[PDB]
Design a protein around this ligand. Structure first.
Ligand code: MET
Ligand SMILES: [Co+2]
Ligand SMILES: [Co+2]
Ligand SMILES: [K+]
Length: 282
């Protein structure tokens, strides 16, 4: 199947003027990066709502995944589910991003921009949706197969999902944050895959990327200890090929240099008093 090329971006989709926009919409940068990593009880409850709605949107767009569809259509669907439930699509107008979710087909590592690109039999596509409601964000993504996908790619998708769940299951207060990337990388190397290092998980709360960074590879130099109330994402990108990548001119779409396919899964997590809670579930 031919390497991907830019489709054509449809016009900015509108969102009900009554839905509160995050502060960064229409601005070159976002006011984020120094927020507390441990959330207040009020923010955690609100994040359960944001998480649930982003999870619903992801699942709706996922069902439209099929040979014949454009990535733009996936965006249309996710956007509509968000607005219908009173949430602003966090990516819309974030640092200039033009759409409501990221659609990353095949060799696109992440941040693909929904467009006219038509999905073909055999492709894989990650859909990443973020919801902003009640002043907080919920972030989640998954890779969906389109039509008859080759074994190599189905195995990649399933093993990336599994790596993600294994990392989530290690989350607990008192455990070193670095355990997450150690578990992910060890599992992916078991199958000869390479874990993307330049892109990471992140703390999230009243801000989209609040400054906390969660690495998906082995990096024991990090000393951060998980604490009850901390909220962050685990969102590993796992490559069949080399880690080398290119960023298109649109400034967002990241594509592997060797064009080999890559897969990603993401959830927003809460560190509870004794373990973990996945907030981005239906
Ligand atoms: C175009 S911004 C996309 C951000 C993505 N939802 C994340 O997990 O950080
Ligand atoms: Co995301
Ligand atoms: Co994220
Ligand atoms: K991909």
């Amino acid at each position: 199947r031919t390497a991907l090329s830019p489709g054509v971006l449809s016009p900015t989709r509108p969102v009900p003027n009554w839905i509160a926009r995050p502060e960064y919409v229409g601005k070159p940068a976002a006011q984020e990066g120094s927020e507390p990593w441990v959330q207040t009880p009020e923010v955690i409850e609100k994040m359960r709502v944001a998480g649930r709605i982003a999870a619903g949107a992801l699942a709706e767009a996922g069902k439209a995944v099929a040979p014949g569809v454009t990535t733009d259509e996936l965006d249309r669907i996710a956007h509509e589910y968000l607005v219908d439930n009173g949430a602003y699509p966090s990516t819309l107008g974030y640092k200039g991003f033009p759409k409501s979710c990221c659609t990353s087909l095949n060799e696109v590592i992440c941040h693909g921009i929904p467009d006219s690109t038509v999905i073909t039999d055999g492709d894989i596509v990650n859909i990443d949706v973020t919801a902003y409601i009640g002043g907080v964000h919920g972030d989640t993504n998954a890779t969906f197969p389109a039509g008859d996908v080759a074994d190599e790619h189905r195995l990649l998708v399933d093993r990336t999902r599994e790596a993600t769940m294994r990392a989530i299951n290690t989350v607990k207060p008192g455990r070193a944050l670095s355990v997450i990337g150690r578990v992910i990388e060890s599992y992916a190397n078991r199958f000869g895959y390479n874990v993307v290092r330049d892109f990471t998980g992140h703390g999230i709360g009243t801000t989209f990327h609040n400054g906390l960074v969660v690495l998906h590879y082995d990096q024991p130099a990090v000393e951060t200890i998980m604490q009850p109330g901390m909220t962050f994402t685990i969102e590993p990108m796992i490559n069949l090929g080399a880690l080398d990548y290119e960023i298109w001119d649109d400034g967002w779409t990241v594509v592997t240099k060797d064009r080999k396919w890559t897969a990603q899964f993401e959830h927003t997590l809460l560190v509870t008093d004794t373990g973990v809670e996945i907030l981005t579930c239906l």
